Design a protein around this ligand. Structure first.
Ligand SMILES: O=C1CNC(=S)N1CCc1ccccc1
Length: 209
């Protein structure tokens, strides 16, 4: 059972802009997702200070990067607070609408795509390198869901039947054919050392067979 939804018009405009603008400095997407994961870890960590049972679904707070050359996917896993079904359908886009509009006003003023993080909507930079994004998420107060979009105006939400995660979020980037450099260990390491040396959680690169 799968539900299909339309993006808000401003978000569909930002995604189509990100997929179509010729922009070579695509590596910033990794910085943005790691920073998002760090935020999600901060929130679960803070909540657990007054309620330790919030960590019953997982005490480790970390970020894994999992390239896969065979499936041409790069997965960013974190054990943060995760997202409810209402987050996936409404709440995230509600908070993002203001940063989307402001970010597009800047782009018409000549501003750079790499400044997307300052408006709180850096996750859509995933579409610089991904033709399709799958988000597997589990929040303490909801069931495990799978969000997916290939842009084009619509996304899907469904209950996830795969491996239970406990708590956290899995961002799976189905990379475009010409963006496989982000599946290489030394390229990922160069980006992480450069863009996210100052994250307060362990970042583990999973290297392949
Ligand atoms: O826009 C929505 C509505 N519901 C969810 S989730 N998003 C976030 C899309 C996203 C893109 C890239 C990386 C991570 C997430």
């Amino acid at each position: 059972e799968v539900e299909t939804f339309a993006f808000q018009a401003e978000i569909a405009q930002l995604m189509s802009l990100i997929i179509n603008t010729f922009y070579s400095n695509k590596e910033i997407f990794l910085r943005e997702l790691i920073s998002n994961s760090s935020d999600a870890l901060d929130k679960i960590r803070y909540e657990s200070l007054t309620d330790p049972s919030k960590l019953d679904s997982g005490k480790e707070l970390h970020i894994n990067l999992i390239p896969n050359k065979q499936d041409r996917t790069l997965t960013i896993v974190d054990t943060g607070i995760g997202m409810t079904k209402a987050d996936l359908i409404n709440n995230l886009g509600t908070i993002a609408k203001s940063g989307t509009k402001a970010f597009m006003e800047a782009l018409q003023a000549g501003a750079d795509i790499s400044m997307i993080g300052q408006f709180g909507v850096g996750f859509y930079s995933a579409y610089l390198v991904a033709e399709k994004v799958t988000v597997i998420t589990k929040h303490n107060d909801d069931e495990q869901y799978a969000w997916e979009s290939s842009a084009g105006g619509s996304f899907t939400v469904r209950t996830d039947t795969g491996e239970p995660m406990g708590r956290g979020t899995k961002v799976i980037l189905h990379l475009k054919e010409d963006q496989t450099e982000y599946l290489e260990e030394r390229r990922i390491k160069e980006i992480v050392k450069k863009h996210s040396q100052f994250i307060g959680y362990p970042i583990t690169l999973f290297v392949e067979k």
